[PDB]
Curated annotation (Swiss-Prot):
Quaternary context: The core secretion machinery of the T3SS is composed of approximately 20 different proteins, including cytoplasmic components, a base, an export apparatus and a needle. This subunit is part of the cytosolic complex. Forms homohexamers. Interacts directly with MxiN/SctL (stator protein) and Spa13/SctO (stalk protein). Can form a soluble complex with Spa33/SctQ, MxiN/SctL and MxiK/SctK.
Effect of residue 106 to A: Lack of ATPase activity. Mutant is unable to form external MxiH/SctF needles and to restore the invasion phenotype in a knockout strain
Protein function: ATPase component of the type III secretion system (T3SS), also called injectisome, which is used to inject bacterial effector proteins into eukaryotic host cells. Acts as a molecular motor to provide the energy that is required for the export of proteins. Required for type III secretion apparatus (T3SA) formation, proper protein secretion, host cell invasion and virulence. May play a critical role in T3SS substrate recognition, disassembly of the effector/chaperone complex and unfolding of the effector in an ATP-dependent manner prior to secretion.
Signal peptide: none
Outcome after substituting residue 208 to D/A/I: Lacks ATPase activity
Sequence positions that bind ATP: 80-85
Activity control: Oligomerization increases ATPase activity. Monomeric forms exhibit low-level ATPase activity by forming short-lived oligomers with active site contributions from at least two protomers. In contrast, oligomers exhibit enhanced ATP hydrolysis rates that likely result from multiple preformed active sites within the oligomeric complex. Oligomerization is important for both enzyme activation and T3SS function.
Catalytic activity, as annotated: ATP + H2O + cellular proteinSide 1 = ADP + phosphate + cellular proteinSide 2
GO cellular component terms attached to this protein's record: cytoplasm; type III protein secretion system complex
GO biological process: protein secretion by the type III secretion system
Full protein name: Type 3 secretion system ATPase
Domain notes: The N-terminal domain is required for oligomerization and ATPase activity. The six N-terminal residues are necessary for proper oligomer formation, though their absence does not entirely preclude oligomerization. The extreme N-terminus is also required for interaction with MxiN/SctL. The N-terminal domain, not ATPase activity, is responsible for localization of Spa47/SctN to the injectisome. The binding of ATP induces a conformational change of a highly conserved luminal loop, facilitating ATP hydrolysis.
Taxonomic source organism: Shigella flexneri
Top-level taxonomic group: Bacteria
Length: 327
């Protein structure tokens, strides 16, 4: 009902009982205070309209799926689509003040791989990890999500630009389902956002694809869809931009970004249709100049979409690259 918060948790690994079990970084600050895990969402007069972009350093996201400070974004993927690796990129290449990660995964070796990565991350001095394995009860697995959110809420009230990761909402829902065996979301997800008098919580929720996805799709402000077929093609991140959206996009980017994003999306749609024309054996070079020009652009847009996970791109570099692609 109450949990540990404060800057003293930076570099610490927190369990479903709120206690420190490990450290991946040690920090000057030892500030540790105490807050209830279930806090009411900001009253609509305290929320600010989402108008500033949360840049991720990832070309596909910052150009076509531009997030906003305070947005909650869904990451939809089936197992083995690199949802954890995409979350690693989001941490490395964004510019948040503090990162709070909530893993409701279940196997034991799960969490330590994340602790291992945070141990070697350049953001380690400003990350907090909350976990809950299968050996914990369903109430504890839930409470891991409330604790991660409460920690992020304290940092937001201090004025920090907070990024929150909940992986996963499915595993969370399974544990939440068993409490019913004896509706925390929307209430769970109404807590992120940007405060008029404070900082922000930009949230990313992972949803395992095999009802639950239909329910949360209408609640969030957008979703990133990781499709297995672009991953087996070798394209990473496996983000299908045409099947993903950030609905605050128009509110967080200017008009030159908007026209370039529209033009790039028309190019993407024309490429996949040309691809199915190729697979059908109906494409002949020199037969249709329009098809041939789109064909000669397939390589340069694949060049833009793919990204090494250790590389980050500034907003200027992303807009410069996309402009030279749609020329």
């Amino acid at each position: 009902l109450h949990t540990q918060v404060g800057r003293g948790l930076l570099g610490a690994v927190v369990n479903p009982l709120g206690e420190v079990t490990d450290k991946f970084a040690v920090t000057d600050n030892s500030e540790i205070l105490y807050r209830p895990v279930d806090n009411a969402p900001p009253l609509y007069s305290e929320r600010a309209a989402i108008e500033k972009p949360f840049l991720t350093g990832i070309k596909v996201i910052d150009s076509l799926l531009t997030c906003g400070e305070g947005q909650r974004m869904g990451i939809f993927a089936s197992a083995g689509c690199g949802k954890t690796f995409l979350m690693n990129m989001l941490i490395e290449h964004s510019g948040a003040d503090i990162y709070v990660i909530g893993l409701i995964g279940e196997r034991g070796r799960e969490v330590t791989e994340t602790v291992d990565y945070l141990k070697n991350s350049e953001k380690k001095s400003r990350c907090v990890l909350v976990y809950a394995t299968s050996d914990y009860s369903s109430v504890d697995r839930c409470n891991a999500a409330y604790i991660a959110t409460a920690i992020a809420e304290f940092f937001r009230t201090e004025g920090h630009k907070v990024a929150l990761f909940i992986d996963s909402l499915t595993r969370y829902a399974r544990a939440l389902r068993d409490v019913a065996l004896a509706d925390s979301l929307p209430r769970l997800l109404a807590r992120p956002g940007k405060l008029k008098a404070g900082g922000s919580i930009t949230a990313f929720y992972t949803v395992l694809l095999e009802p639950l996805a239909e329910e949360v799709r209408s609640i969030l402000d957008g979703h990133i869809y990781l499709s297995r077929n672009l991953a087996q093609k070798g394209q990473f991140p496996a983000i299908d931009s045409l099947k993903s959206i950030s609905r605050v996009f128009t509110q967080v980017v200017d008009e030159k970004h908007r026209i370039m994003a529209a033009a790039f999306r028309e190019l993407l749609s024309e490429i996949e249709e040309l691809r199915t024309i190729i697979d059908f054996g109906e494409y002949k070079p020199g037969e249709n100049a329009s098809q041939d020009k789109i064909y000669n652009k397939i390589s340069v847009v694949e060049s833009f979409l793919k990204q090494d996970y250790r590389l980050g791109f500034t907003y200027e570099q992303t807009m410069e690259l996309i402009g030279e692609t749609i020329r």
